[PDB]
Amino acid sequence: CSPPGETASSEPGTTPAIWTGSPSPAAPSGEDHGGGHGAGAAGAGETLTAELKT
Amino acid sequence: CSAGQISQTTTQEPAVNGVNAQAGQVSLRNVHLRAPQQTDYVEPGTTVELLFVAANDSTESNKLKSITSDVGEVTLTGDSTVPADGVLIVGEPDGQIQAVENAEAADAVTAEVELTKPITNGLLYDFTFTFEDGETTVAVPISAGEQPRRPVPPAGPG
Amino acid sequence: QSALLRTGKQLFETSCVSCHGANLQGVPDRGPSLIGTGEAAVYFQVSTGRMPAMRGEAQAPSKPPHFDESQIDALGAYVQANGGGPTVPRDDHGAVAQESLIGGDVARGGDLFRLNCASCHNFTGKGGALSSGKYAPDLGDANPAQIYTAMLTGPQNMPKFSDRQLTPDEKRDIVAYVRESAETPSYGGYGLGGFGPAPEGMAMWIIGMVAAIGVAMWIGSRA
Numbered sequence: 162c163s164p165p166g167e168t169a170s171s172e173p174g175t176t177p178a179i180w181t182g183s184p185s186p187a188a189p190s191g192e193d194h195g196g197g198h199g200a201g202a203a204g205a206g207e208t209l210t211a212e213l214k215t
Numbered sequence: 216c217s218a219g220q221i222s223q224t225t226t227q228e229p230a231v232n233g234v235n236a237q238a239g240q241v242s243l244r245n246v247h248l249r250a251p252q253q254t255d256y257v258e259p260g261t262t263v264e265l266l267f268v269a270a271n272d273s274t275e276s277n278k279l280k281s282i283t284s285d286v287g288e289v290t291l292t293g294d295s296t297v298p299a300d301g302v303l304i305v306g307e308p309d310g311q312i313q314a315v316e317n318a319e320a321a322d323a324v325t326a327e328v329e330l331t332k333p334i335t336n337g338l339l340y341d342f343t344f345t346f347e348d349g350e351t352t353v354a355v356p357i358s359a360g361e362q363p364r365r366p367v368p369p370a371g372p373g
Numbered sequence: 374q375s376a377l378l379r380t381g382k383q384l385f386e387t388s389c390v391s392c393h394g395a396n397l398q399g400v401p402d403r404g405p406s407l408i409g410t411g412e413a414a415v416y417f418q419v420s421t422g423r424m425p426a427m428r429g430e431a432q433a434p435s436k437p438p439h440f441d442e443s444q445i446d447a448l449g450a451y452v453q454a455n456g457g458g459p460t461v462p463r464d465d466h467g468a469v470a471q472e473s474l475i476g477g478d479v480a481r482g483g484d485l486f487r488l489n490c491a492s493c494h495n496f497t498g499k500g501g502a503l504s505s506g507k508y509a510p511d512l513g514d515a516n517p518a519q520i521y522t523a524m525l526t527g528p529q530n531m532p533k534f535s536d537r538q539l540t541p542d543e544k545r546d547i548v549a550y551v552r553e554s555a556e557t558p559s560y561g562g563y564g565l566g567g568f569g570p571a572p573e574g575m576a577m578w579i580i581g582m583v584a585a586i587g588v589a590m591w592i593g594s595r596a
């Protein structure tokens with residue numbers, strides 16, 4: 162005997178798409194904190210940058 | 216009888232990243248792309264260089280190298296009709312030595328491509344090299360010539 | 374260098390143009406093109422002697438080198454100029470580096486060797502067999518530059534370990550482990566080659582068992 166599933170010459174295939182990993186659900190819910198702050202508004206956190214251009 | 220007409224040693228491609236395209240009178244060797252990528256893709260609009268060596272097989276010559284352009288608009292700066300029983304070295308693969316203080320025809324036929332399409336290392340991208348004798352698709356790879364590892368960020372256990 | 378390039382060309386033209394055609398392009402079905410192989414490939418291959426090759430077979434065997442260090446450098450420079458590629462390491466003076474390639478860490482080198490090298494060579498760099506007439510040779514003859522360049526350019530049926538895949542520090546550690554395992558004396562007696570079960574069983578059956586049987590024949594009486 163030989164393995165039932167082999168030798169699919171047809172269907173050349175396609176290049177895999179860029180992987181976009183989903184965030185870890187409640188199972189591995191652990192994630193890095195984005196920054197603690199008072200946040201007396203809708204929420205900004207302790208991380209905010211900006212680029213002053215010309 | 217590993218020495219018969221089909222022997223392992225003889226039927227071996229060079230251990231180089233560039234592909235070989237023997238189709239046509241002029242043979243293309245070590246044809247690759249120097250496209251240093253800082254992320255998943257080399258974004259369109261950035262110029263990456265096209266390395267290869269065109270060796271002439273016949274002395275009777277095929278020194279035209281008309282267009283050799285594909286998706287990306289490959290342009291041949293300092294183009295010259297070099298191949299006459301010899302080599303046309305378009306660029307300087309990493310580790311290349313100039314071999315003399317001066318130079319001939321300024322750059323030695325440097326081929327550069329404005330991508331107009333994302334590319335990434337590990338993929339094969341078709342290039343149609345067309346000499347007056349004929350045209351051949353080569354399926355050039357992306358090669359990181361001599362650049363060492365780019366430092367990946369340290370991992371924070373979670 | 375100009376004269377180095379000229380010497381490399383002269384050696385090439387009267388050594389290998391029959392199988393690595395002039396212009397460094399490969400002769401179809403006799404030898405691969407040397408464009409892009411680099412100086413490291415030439416150094417390793419010619420210094421080990423494999424390249425003055427007088428047969429097409431399963432594997433090109435090692436042999437005494439046909440060129441001295443200066444001619445090896447000339448050929449390597451010629452091939453590097455023609456194709457452009459990996460370069461053999463060198464020390465401060467300019468000679469091919471031997472001691473500088475001995476990595477400081479040997480445990481790391483051994484781990485990397487086992488993960489990557491022992492796969493086919495051995496636990497300690499003795500030889501190994503391959504599919505059809507091929508074989509991974511013993512590493513005890515190779516010098517640090519030869520080991521480093523062997524990794525840098527996969528010679529034949531050997532994976533090509535780029536600097537990105539094995540940073541030169543990792544390759545230096547592997548070189549240190551190879552040299553240490555090769556030059557280290559067998560603790561516990563004569564290591565019968567480096568393969569445990571087979572040489573050990575043969576030595577049992579030939580040394581211990583013939584001794585026991587001969588002593589039994591001496592003590593007892595034939596009948």
Ligand SMILES: CC(C)=CCC/C(C)=C/CC/C(C)=C/CC/C(C)=C/CC/C(C)=C/CC/C(C)=C/CC/C(C)=C/CC/C(C)=C/CC/C(C)=C/CC1=C(C)C(=O)c2ccccc2C1=O
Nearest residue numbers: 499563564565566567568570571572573574575576577579
């Ligand atoms: C599955 C299977 C057995 C396939 C065939 C493989 C096999 C055993 C082939 C034969 C090996 C030989 C004899 C190769 C030489 C070339 C050859 C075939 C010549 C013709 C043979 C012939 C008819 C010759 C005329 C008379 C004759 C029969 C001479 C035989 C010569 C020999 C080699 C005799 C002794 C037998 C022998 C040593 C066989 C190899 C087997 C083993 C397991 C050796 C173990 C061993 C090894 C492998 C070490 O590396 C080592 C390193 C350091 C210390 C110790 C050892 C050690 O003990």
Ligand SMILES: CCCCCCCCCCCCCCCC(=O)O[C@H](COC(=O)CCCCCCC[C@@H](C)CCCCCCCCC)COP(=O)(O)O[C@H]1[C@H](O)[C@H](O)[C@H](O)[C@@H](O)[C@@H]1O
Nearest residue numbers: 499511512513555556558559562563564565575576579580
């Ligand atoms: C009867 C009881 C007595 C038992 C024998 C005890 C002998 C004690 C010897 C002295 C103490 C131990 C020395 C240990 C130092 C040591 O190990 O010894 C090597 C040598 O080794 C060799 O070559 C072998 C040389 C030949 C002499 C020994 C042959 C004895 C065999 C025949 C005994 C088994 C019986 C088998 C019967 C076979 C017939 C079957 C039908 C020498 O170095 P080297 O040679 O360079 O080893 C290479 C590394 O360098 C290099 O990297 C590495 O890559 C390797 O290439 C390595 O070989």
Ligand code: HEC
Nearest residue numbers: 421489490493508509512514515520523528529530531532
């Ligand atoms: C089977 C896959 C393979 C692996 C993986 C491999 N080798 Fe090799 N090695 C070979 C083969 C086959 C040769 C013979 C090449 C030739 O003769 O052209 C060789 C040649 C060598 C040589 C030349 C020895 C001499 O005396 O000529 C050395 C040294 C070496 N390898 C060490 C290493 C090192 C260091 C690594 C790093 C992990 C490694 N090997 C990984 C198969 C492998």
Ligand code: HEC
Nearest residue numbers: 224229230388389392404410414415418424425426433529
């Ligand atoms: C057919 C006889 C033969 C001759 C003679 C010969 N080569 Fe080769 N060459 C080969 C073969 C076959 C290979 C690939 C298989 C191998 O190396 O075992 C090769 C591969 C090479 C490689 C390694 C290519 C790679 O991708 O790693 C180098 C370097 C090289 N040759 C240079 C030379 C130089 C320099 C000479 C002359 C000093 C020479 N060769 C003489 C046949 C030959």
Ligand SMILES: CCCCCCCCCCCCCCCC(=O)OC[C@H](C)OC(=O)CCCCCCCC[C@@H](C)CCCCCCCC
Nearest residue numbers: 216217218219220221222223429430431432504505506507
């Ligand atoms: C039935 C058992 C008896 C045999 C019956 C009649 C046996 C009659 C045997 C016809 C054999 C025909 C072969 C046809 C070759 C082929 O088309 O394939 C090519 C292959 C690719 O080429 C090879 O790879 C090697 C081919 C050479 C074989 C060397 C063998 C040398 C033997 C020595 C090692 C000595 C051994 C001791 C042997 C000792 C015996 C001495 C006679």
Ligand SMILES: *C(=O)CCCCCCCCCCCCCCC
Nearest residue numbers: 216217218219220430431505506
């Ligand atoms: C490669 O491994 C070997 C190549 C040899 C091919 C030619 C063989 C010629 C025939 C030899 C005869 C052997 C003895 C026959 C016994 C009956």
